[PDB]
Design a protein around this ligand. Sequence first.
Ligand code: C8E
Ligand code: C8E
Ligand code: NA
Ligand code: NA
Ligand code: NI
Ligand code: NI
Length: 408
Amino acid sequence: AGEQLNEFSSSGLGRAYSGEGAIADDAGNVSRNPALITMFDRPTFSAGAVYIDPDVNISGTSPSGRSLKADNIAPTAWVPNMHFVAPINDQFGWGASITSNYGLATEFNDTYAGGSVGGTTDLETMNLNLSGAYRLNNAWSFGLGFNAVYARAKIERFAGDLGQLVAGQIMQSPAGQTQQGQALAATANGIDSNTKIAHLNGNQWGFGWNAGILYELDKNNRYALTYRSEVKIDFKGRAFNNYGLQSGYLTLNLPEMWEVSGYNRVDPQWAIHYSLAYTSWSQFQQLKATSTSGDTLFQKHEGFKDAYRIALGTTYYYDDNWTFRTGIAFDDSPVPAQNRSISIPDQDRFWLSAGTTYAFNKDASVDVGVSYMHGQSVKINEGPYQFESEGKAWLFGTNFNYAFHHHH
Ligand SMILES: CCCCCCCCOCCOCCOCCOCCO
Ligand SMILES: CCCCCCCCOCCOCCOCCOCCO
Ligand code: NA
Ligand code: NA
Ligand code: NI
Ligand code: NI
Protein backbone atom coordinates (compact mmCIF):
# COMPACT_ATOMS: atom_id res chain seq x y z
CA ALA A 1 0.00 0.00 0.00
CA GLY A 2 0.98 3.63 -0.44
CA GLU A 3 4.66 3.91 -1.36
CA GLN A 4 5.42 0.29 -0.53
CA LEU A 5 6.99 -1.85 -3.22
CA ASN A 6 6.94 -5.63 -3.19
CA GLU A 7 9.06 -6.12 -6.30
CA PHE A 8 12.10 -7.97 -4.91
CA SER A 9 11.95 -10.78 -7.50
CA SER A 10 10.33 -11.88 -10.76
CA SER A 11 9.29 -15.31 -9.47
CA GLY A 12 7.48 -13.52 -6.65
CA LEU A 13 5.73 -11.32 -9.21
CA GLY A 14 4.19 -14.39 -10.82
CA ARG A 15 2.84 -15.57 -7.43
CA ALA A 16 1.37 -12.16 -6.52
CA TYR A 17 3.97 -12.17 -3.69
CA SER A 18 2.15 -14.91 -1.80
CA GLY A 19 3.82 -16.69 1.12
CA GLU A 20 7.14 -15.06 0.30
CA GLY A 21 8.55 -15.67 3.80
CA ALA A 22 8.17 -19.42 3.32
CA ILE A 23 9.23 -20.24 -0.23
CA ALA A 24 12.88 -20.79 -1.18
CA ASP A 25 12.97 -22.08 -4.75
CA ASP A 26 15.41 -19.28 -5.61
CA ALA A 27 17.72 -16.83 -3.79
CA GLY A 28 15.34 -13.86 -3.97
CA ASN A 29 13.38 -14.83 -0.87
CA VAL A 30 16.25 -14.37 1.59
CA SER A 31 15.71 -10.61 1.25
CA ARG A 32 12.11 -11.18 2.47
CA ASN A 33 13.01 -13.65 5.24
CA PRO A 34 16.65 -14.03 6.31
CA ALA A 35 15.87 -17.34 8.07
CA LEU A 36 15.42 -18.85 4.59
CA ILE A 37 19.23 -18.78 4.23
CA THR A 38 19.23 -22.22 5.89
CA MET A 39 17.30 -23.67 2.93
CA PHE A 40 20.30 -23.23 0.61
CA ASP A 41 23.16 -25.74 0.44
CA ARG A 42 25.32 -23.94 -2.11
CA PRO A 43 26.11 -20.36 -3.16
CA THR A 44 23.19 -19.09 -5.22
CA PHE A 45 22.77 -15.88 -7.21
CA SER A 46 19.75 -14.14 -8.71
CA ALA A 47 19.29 -10.83 -10.50
CA GLY A 48 16.66 -9.12 -12.56
CA ALA A 49 14.15 -6.31 -12.74
CA VAL A 50 10.48 -5.47 -12.76
CA TYR A 51 8.96 -2.87 -15.07
CA ILE A 52 5.94 -1.10 -13.58
CA ASP A 53 3.50 0.72 -15.86
CA PRO A 54 0.86 2.51 -13.76
CA ASP A 55 -2.11 4.49 -15.04
CA VAL A 56 -3.34 6.91 -12.40
CA ASN A 57 -5.85 9.69 -13.12
CA ILE A 58 -7.12 12.55 -10.96
CA SER A 59 -10.41 14.38 -11.47
CA GLY A 60 -12.39 17.17 -9.86
CA THR A 61 -13.19 20.87 -9.89
CA SER A 62 -11.66 23.52 -7.62
CA PRO A 63 -13.80 25.99 -5.65
CA SER A 64 -12.14 28.54 -7.97
CA GLY A 65 -13.88 26.91 -10.93
CA ARG A 66 -10.62 25.61 -12.36
CA SER A 67 -10.34 22.00 -13.46
CA LEU A 68 -8.54 19.49 -11.19
CA LYS A 69 -8.31 16.96 -14.00
CA ALA A 70 -4.84 15.44 -14.36
CA ASP A 71 -4.34 12.36 -16.53
CA ASN A 72 -1.56 9.81 -16.25
CA ILE A 73 0.23 11.34 -13.25
CA ALA A 74 2.34 8.28 -12.37
CA PRO A 75 5.28 7.49 -14.68
CA THR A 76 6.71 4.09 -15.51
CA ALA A 77 9.57 2.70 -13.47
CA TRP A 78 12.15 -0.06 -13.46
CA VAL A 79 12.89 -1.74 -10.15
CA PRO A 80 16.06 -3.87 -10.15
CA ASN A 81 16.94 -6.69 -7.77
CA MET A 82 20.08 -8.71 -7.04
CA HIS A 83 20.62 -11.47 -4.48
CA PHE A 84 23.40 -13.72 -3.22
CA VAL A 85 23.16 -16.46 -0.59
CA ALA A 86 25.79 -18.93 0.62
CA PRO A 87 26.17 -21.47 3.39
CA ILE A 88 29.04 -21.08 5.83
CA ASN A 89 28.60 -24.44 7.53
CA ASP A 90 25.96 -26.91 8.65
CA GLN A 91 24.50 -24.37 11.06
CA PHE A 92 25.17 -20.95 9.54
CA GLY A 93 24.78 -19.07 6.29
CA TRP A 94 24.72 -15.50 5.00
CA GLY A 95 23.29 -13.46 2.17
CA ALA A 96 23.31 -10.02 0.60
CA SER A 97 20.85 -8.23 -1.62
CA ILE A 98 20.08 -5.01 -3.41
CA THR A 99 16.35 -4.32 -3.67
CA SER A 100 13.79 -1.55 -3.26
CA ASN A 101 10.78 -1.78 -1.00
CA TYR A 102 9.70 1.86 -1.15
CA GLY A 103 9.18 4.35 -3.94
CA LEU A 104 6.91 7.01 -5.37
CA ALA A 105 6.61 9.14 -8.46
CA THR A 106 3.85 11.49 -9.54
CA GLU A 107 4.00 14.53 -11.79
CA PHE A 108 1.46 17.25 -12.56
CA ASN A 109 1.74 20.10 -15.05
CA ASP A 110 3.20 23.12 -13.29
CA THR A 111 0.11 25.19 -14.21
CA TYR A 112 -2.24 22.69 -12.51
CA ALA A 113 -4.85 24.44 -10.36
CA GLY A 114 -4.11 22.07 -7.45
CA GLY A 115 -0.37 22.70 -7.74
CA SER A 116 0.14 23.42 -4.03
CA VAL A 117 -0.56 19.71 -3.45
CA GLY A 118 0.36 18.52 -6.96
CA GLY A 119 3.61 19.53 -8.65
CA THR A 120 6.23 16.77 -8.65
CA THR A 121 7.07 14.12 -6.08
CA ASP A 122 9.81 11.60 -6.72
CA LEU A 123 11.10 9.28 -4.04
CA GLU A 124 13.52 6.52 -4.97
CA THR A 125 15.15 4.12 -2.52
CA MET A 126 17.79 1.42 -2.72
CA ASN A 127 17.95 -1.13 0.08
CA LEU A 128 21.32 -2.78 0.68
CA ASN A 129 20.93 -5.80 2.91
CA LEU A 130 23.37 -8.11 4.68
CA SER A 131 21.81 -11.09 6.47
CA GLY A 132 22.87 -14.09 8.53
CA ALA A 133 21.01 -17.17 9.70
CA TYR A 134 21.35 -20.02 12.17
CA ARG A 135 19.72 -23.45 11.88
CA LEU A 136 18.87 -24.76 15.34
CA ASN A 137 17.61 -28.14 14.13
CA ASN A 138 15.65 -29.73 11.29
CA ALA A 139 12.61 -27.65 12.19
CA TRP A 140 13.78 -24.26 13.44
CA SER A 141 15.83 -21.54 11.74
CA PHE A 142 16.44 -17.91 12.69
CA GLY A 143 17.69 -14.99 10.63
CA LEU A 144 18.74 -11.38 11.15
CA GLY A 145 19.51 -8.71 8.59
CA PHE A 146 20.81 -5.18 8.51
CA ASN A 147 19.73 -2.60 5.98
CA ALA A 148 21.38 0.50 4.57
CA VAL A 149 18.85 2.52 2.60
CA TYR A 150 19.85 5.18 0.08
CA ALA A 151 16.98 7.57 -0.50
CA ARG A 152 16.70 10.25 -3.17
CA ALA A 153 13.94 12.86 -3.14
CA LYS A 154 12.71 15.56 -5.48
CA ILE A 155 9.62 17.46 -4.41
CA GLU A 156 8.19 20.60 -6.01
CA ARG A 157 4.96 22.48 -5.28
CA PHE A 158 3.39 25.44 -7.07
CA ALA A 159 0.84 28.13 -6.30
CA GLY A 160 -1.84 26.68 -8.58
CA ASP A 161 -5.07 28.60 -8.05
CA LEU A 162 -4.48 29.53 -4.40
CA GLY A 163 -4.28 33.24 -5.19
CA GLN A 164 -7.65 32.94 -6.93
CA LEU A 165 -9.20 31.33 -3.86
CA VAL A 166 -7.81 34.13 -1.71
CA ALA A 167 -9.08 36.76 -4.15
CA GLY A 168 -12.56 35.24 -3.98
CA GLN A 169 -12.54 35.21 -0.19
CA ILE A 170 -11.45 38.85 -0.07
CA MET A 171 -14.13 39.86 -2.55
CA GLN A 172 -16.82 38.06 -0.55
CA SER A 173 -15.78 39.83 2.66
CA PRO A 174 -16.66 43.42 3.62
CA ALA A 175 -13.19 44.24 2.28
CA GLY A 176 -14.53 43.46 -1.20
CA GLN A 177 -16.51 46.68 -1.00
CA THR A 178 -13.39 48.83 -0.67
CA GLN A 179 -10.77 50.03 -3.14
CA GLN A 180 -8.02 48.65 -0.91
CA GLY A 181 -9.68 45.24 -0.64
CA GLN A 182 -10.21 45.07 -4.38
CA ALA A 183 -6.55 45.89 -4.97
CA LEU A 184 -5.46 43.19 -2.54
CA ALA A 185 -7.72 40.67 -4.28
CA ALA A 186 -6.23 41.61 -7.64
CA THR A 187 -2.72 41.15 -6.24
CA ALA A 188 -3.64 37.68 -4.98
CA ASN A 189 -5.35 36.70 -8.25
CA GLY A 190 -2.32 37.88 -10.23
CA ILE A 191 -0.05 35.17 -8.79
CA ASP A 192 1.01 32.83 -11.63
CA SER A 193 -0.13 29.23 -11.12
CA ASN A 194 3.39 28.05 -12.01
CA THR A 195 4.98 30.10 -9.21
CA LYS A 196 7.15 27.64 -7.29
CA ILE A 197 6.26 27.72 -3.59
CA ALA A 198 8.20 24.76 -2.18
CA HIS A 199 11.21 22.73 -3.22
CA LEU A 200 13.25 19.81 -1.95
CA ASN A 201 16.01 17.89 -3.66
CA GLY A 202 18.12 15.55 -1.57
CA ASN A 203 20.02 12.31 -1.09
CA GLN A 204 20.45 10.60 2.29
CA TRP A 205 21.16 7.23 3.90
CA GLY A 206 19.17 5.64 6.69
CA PHE A 207 19.50 2.34 8.52
CA GLY A 208 17.26 -0.44 9.75
CA TRP A 209 17.11 -4.12 10.55
CA ASN A 210 14.95 -7.12 9.76
CA ALA A 211 14.47 -10.59 11.19
CA GLY A 212 12.76 -13.86 10.52
CA ILE A 213 11.83 -17.20 11.99
CA LEU A 214 11.22 -20.34 9.95
CA TYR A 215 9.46 -23.50 11.14
CA GLU A 216 9.63 -26.56 8.88
CA LEU A 217 7.13 -29.37 9.50
CA ASP A 218 9.11 -31.36 6.94
CA LYS A 219 10.81 -30.74 3.57
CA ASN A 220 7.43 -30.00 1.96
CA ASN A 221 5.71 -27.70 4.46
CA ARG A 222 6.88 -24.64 6.34
CA TYR A 223 5.76 -21.44 8.01
CA ALA A 224 7.45 -18.12 8.68
CA LEU A 225 7.16 -14.95 10.71
CA THR A 226 9.16 -11.87 9.69
CA TYR A 227 9.63 -8.28 10.85
CA ARG A 228 11.13 -5.27 9.09
CA SER A 229 11.95 -2.17 11.12
CA GLU A 230 11.14 1.40 10.31
CA VAL A 231 13.90 3.33 8.58
CA LYS A 232 14.29 7.04 9.31
CA ILE A 233 15.54 9.25 6.48
CA ASP A 234 16.44 12.83 7.36
CA PHE A 235 16.85 15.06 4.33
CA LYS A 236 18.74 18.23 5.12
CA GLY A 237 19.85 21.07 2.86
CA ARG A 238 38.84 22.49 -3.52
CA ALA A 239 40.40 24.80 -4.50
CA PHE A 240 42.87 21.88 -4.35
CA ASN A 241 41.95 21.15 -7.32
CA ASN A 242 41.77 24.66 -8.69
CA TYR A 243 45.50 24.42 -7.97
CA GLY A 244 45.00 26.84 -5.10
CA LEU A 245 42.48 29.26 -6.61
CA GLN A 246 20.96 19.63 -1.75
CA SER A 247 18.06 21.88 -0.76
CA GLY A 248 15.23 21.49 1.74
CA TYR A 249 14.42 19.51 4.88
CA LEU A 250 12.16 16.51 5.44
CA THR A 251 12.06 13.63 7.90
CA LEU A 252 10.61 10.55 6.27
CA ASN A 253 9.92 7.32 8.16
CA LEU A 254 9.73 4.21 6.01
CA PRO A 255 7.10 1.83 7.40
CA GLU A 256 7.60 -1.28 9.53
CA MET A 257 6.12 -4.58 8.33
CA TRP A 258 5.20 -7.90 9.92
CA GLU A 259 4.45 -10.90 7.71
CA VAL A 260 3.30 -14.47 8.28
CA SER A 261 3.73 -16.96 5.43
CA GLY A 262 2.93 -20.56 4.63
CA TYR A 263 4.08 -22.96 1.91
CA ASN A 264 2.65 -26.43 1.34
CA ARG A 265 3.89 -28.73 -1.38
CA VAL A 266 0.79 -30.90 -1.50
CA ASP A 267 2.00 -33.05 -4.40
CA PRO A 268 5.30 -33.50 -6.24
CA GLN A 269 3.84 -31.22 -8.91
CA TRP A 270 1.90 -28.69 -6.80
CA ALA A 271 2.44 -26.17 -4.03
CA ILE A 272 0.24 -23.53 -2.47
CA HIS A 273 1.57 -20.50 -0.63
CA TYR A 274 -0.12 -17.66 1.21
CA SER A 275 0.55 -14.77 3.53
CA LEU A 276 -0.84 -12.01 5.68
CA ALA A 277 1.28 -8.89 5.98
CA TYR A 278 0.70 -5.93 8.28
CA THR A 279 2.33 -2.57 7.57
CA SER A 280 2.35 0.45 9.83
CA TRP A 281 3.48 4.02 9.27
CA SER A 282 4.29 6.61 11.92
CA GLN A 283 3.36 9.51 9.59
CA PHE A 284 0.34 10.55 7.52
CA GLN A 285 0.68 11.35 3.80
CA GLN A 286 -0.10 15.04 3.35
CA LEU A 287 2.75 17.54 3.40
CA LYS A 288 2.91 20.92 5.08
CA ALA A 289 5.56 23.35 3.88
CA THR A 290 7.17 26.27 5.68
CA SER A 291 10.51 27.91 5.05
CA THR A 292 13.69 28.76 6.86
CA SER A 293 16.08 31.19 5.22
CA GLY A 294 14.33 30.55 1.91
CA ASP A 295 14.79 26.76 2.07
CA THR A 296 11.69 24.59 2.31
CA LEU A 297 10.86 22.69 5.47
CA PHE A 298 8.45 19.88 4.61
CA GLN A 299 6.62 18.05 7.40
CA LYS A 300 4.23 15.11 7.50
CA HIS A 301 1.71 14.82 10.36
CA GLU A 302 2.87 12.41 13.09
CA GLY A 303 0.09 9.84 13.23
CA PHE A 304 -0.52 6.10 13.03
CA LYS A 305 -1.58 4.66 9.66
CA ASP A 306 -1.78 0.97 8.74
CA ALA A 307 -2.65 -1.46 5.98
CA TYR A 308 -2.70 -5.19 5.41
CA ARG A 309 -2.20 -7.46 2.46
CA ILE A 310 -3.46 -10.99 1.94
CA ALA A 311 -2.09 -13.18 -0.83
CA LEU A 312 -2.64 -16.68 -2.16
CA GLY A 313 -0.91 -18.47 -4.99
CA THR A 314 -0.04 -21.81 -6.46
CA THR A 315 2.97 -23.27 -8.20
CA TYR A 316 2.77 -26.10 -10.74
CA TYR A 317 6.12 -27.91 -10.88
CA TYR A 318 5.30 -29.35 -14.29
CA ASP A 319 8.63 -31.03 -15.02
CA ASP A 320 12.39 -30.72 -14.53
CA ASN A 321 12.50 -27.69 -16.82
CA TRP A 322 9.16 -25.94 -16.51
CA THR A 323 7.44 -24.38 -13.52
CA PHE A 324 4.23 -22.33 -13.77
CA ARG A 325 2.69 -20.09 -11.13
CA THR A 326 -0.27 -17.85 -10.49
CA GLY A 327 -1.59 -15.79 -7.63
CA ILE A 328 -4.13 -13.33 -6.30
CA ALA A 329 -3.72 -10.65 -3.63
CA PHE A 330 -5.55 -7.84 -1.93
CA ASP A 331 -3.88 -4.88 -0.27
CA ASP A 332 -6.31 -3.05 1.99
CA SER A 333 -5.48 0.55 2.83
CA PRO A 334 -8.25 2.24 4.82
CA VAL A 335 -7.15 5.87 4.65
CA PRO A 336 -9.90 8.46 5.29
CA ALA A 337 -10.50 10.74 2.26
CA GLN A 338 -9.35 13.76 4.25
CA ASN A 339 -5.98 12.07 4.94
CA ARG A 340 -5.21 11.00 1.37
CA SER A 341 -2.92 12.87 -1.03
CA ILE A 342 -3.07 13.32 -4.80
CA SER A 343 0.72 13.11 -4.93
CA ILE A 344 0.75 9.64 -3.36
CA PRO A 345 -1.31 6.89 -5.03
CA ASP A 346 -3.08 5.06 -2.23
CA GLN A 347 -6.12 2.85 -2.65
CA ASP A 348 -7.17 -0.74 -2.15
CA ARG A 349 -5.24 -2.85 -4.65
CA PHE A 350 -6.29 -6.17 -6.14
CA TRP A 351 -3.60 -8.31 -7.85
CA LEU A 352 -3.85 -11.04 -10.48
CA SER A 353 -0.53 -12.65 -11.41
CA ALA A 354 0.99 -15.36 -13.57
CA GLY A 355 4.51 -16.57 -14.20
CA THR A 356 6.84 -19.27 -15.44
CA THR A 357 10.38 -20.44 -14.83
CA TYR A 358 12.54 -22.36 -17.29
CA ALA A 359 15.50 -24.26 -15.88
CA PHE A 360 18.27 -24.97 -18.38
CA ASN A 361 19.73 -27.41 -15.87
CA LYS A 362 20.06 -27.86 -12.11
CA ASP A 363 22.26 -24.74 -11.89
CA ALA A 364 20.62 -22.09 -14.07
CA SER A 365 17.12 -20.76 -14.71
CA VAL A 366 15.09 -17.78 -15.88
CA ASP A 367 11.88 -16.48 -14.32
CA VAL A 368 9.30 -14.37 -16.16
CA GLY A 369 6.35 -12.82 -14.34
CA VAL A 370 3.38 -10.58 -15.04
CA SER A 371 0.85 -8.92 -12.77
CA TYR A 372 -2.23 -6.79 -13.28
CA MET A 373 -3.15 -4.46 -10.44
CA HIS A 374 -6.62 -2.97 -10.16
CA GLY A 375 -6.91 0.05 -7.91
CA GLN A 376 -10.05 1.15 -6.10
CA SER A 377 -11.45 4.54 -7.13
CA VAL A 378 -11.21 6.86 -4.11
CA LYS A 379 -12.09 10.34 -2.91
CA ILE A 380 -9.31 12.64 -1.73
CA ASN A 381 -9.88 15.81 0.29
CA GLU A 382 -6.61 17.72 0.51
CA GLY A 383 -6.18 21.39 1.33
CA PRO A 384 -9.07 23.42 -0.11
CA TYR A 385 -9.72 20.79 -2.79
CA GLN A 386 -11.83 17.70 -3.39
CA PHE A 387 -10.58 15.12 -5.88
CA GLU A 388 -11.28 11.65 -7.14
CA SER A 389 -8.56 9.24 -8.15
CA GLU A 390 -8.61 6.07 -10.25
CA GLY A 391 -5.63 3.78 -10.77
CA LYS A 392 -4.36 0.51 -12.17
CA ALA A 393 -1.01 -0.90 -13.28
CA TRP A 394 0.71 -3.64 -15.23
CA LEU A 395 3.96 -5.16 -13.98
CA PHE A 396 6.42 -7.30 -15.96
CA GLY A 397 9.58 -8.91 -14.66
CA THR A 398 12.42 -11.26 -15.49
CA ASN A 399 15.22 -12.72 -13.35
CA PHE A 400 18.18 -14.96 -14.02
CA ASN A 401 19.15 -17.54 -11.39
CA TYR A 402 22.48 -19.34 -11.07
CA ALA A 403 23.86 -21.70 -8.45
CA PHE A 404 27.64 -22.18 -8.21
CA HIS A 405 29.82 -25.28 -7.89
CA HIS A 406 28.40 -27.52 -10.58
CA HIS A 407 29.93 -30.97 -10.10
CA HIS A 408 29.10 -34.68 -10.25
C1 C8E B 1 -16.36 29.91 -0.70
C2 C8E B 1 -15.15 30.41 -1.48
C3 C8E B 1 -15.29 31.89 -1.81
C4 C8E B 1 -15.80 32.11 -3.23
C5 C8E B 1 -15.33 31.00 -4.16
C6 C8E B 1 -14.51 31.57 -5.32
C7 C8E B 1 -15.34 31.69 -6.59
C8 C8E B 1 -15.18 33.07 -7.21
O1 C8E B 1 -13.85 33.52 -7.05
C9 C8E B 1 -13.22 33.78 -8.29
C10 C8E B 1 -11.78 34.22 -8.03
O2 C8E B 1 -11.31 35.01 -9.10
C11 C8E B 1 -10.35 35.95 -8.67
C12 C8E B 1 -10.57 37.32 -9.29
O3 C8E B 1 -10.56 38.30 -8.28
C13 C8E B 1 -11.35 39.42 -8.61
C14 C8E B 1 -10.50 40.44 -9.36
O4 C8E B 1 -11.35 41.33 -10.06
C15 C8E B 1 -12.33 41.90 -9.23
C16 C8E B 1 -12.28 43.42 -9.31
O5 C8E B 1 -12.54 43.97 -8.04
C1 C8E C 1 24.38 -3.26 4.04
C2 C8E C 1 23.96 -3.40 5.49
C3 C8E C 1 24.89 -2.63 6.42
C4 C8E C 1 24.11 -1.66 7.29
C5 C8E C 1 23.99 -2.16 8.73
C6 C8E C 1 23.66 -1.04 9.70
C7 C8E C 1 22.46 -1.40 10.57
C8 C8E C 1 22.36 -0.49 11.79
O1 C8E C 1 21.03 -0.06 11.99
C9 C8E C 1 20.33 -0.78 12.98
C10 C8E C 1 19.47 0.20 13.76
O2 C8E C 1 18.33 0.56 13.01
C11 C8E C 1 17.39 1.26 13.80
C12 C8E C 1 16.11 0.45 13.97
O3 C8E C 1 15.01 1.33 14.03
C13 C8E C 1 14.46 1.42 15.33
C14 C8E C 1 13.82 0.10 15.76
O4 C8E C 1 14.81 -0.77 16.28
C15 C8E C 1 15.54 -0.19 17.33
C16 C8E C 1 15.54 -1.10 18.54
O5 C8E C 1 16.86 -1.53 18.82
NA1 NA D 1 -0.30 5.10 -18.61
NA1 NA E 1 -12.47 18.83 -15.13
NI1 NI F 1 -10.53 -1.49 1.93
NI1 NI G 1 29.09 -31.47 -15.73
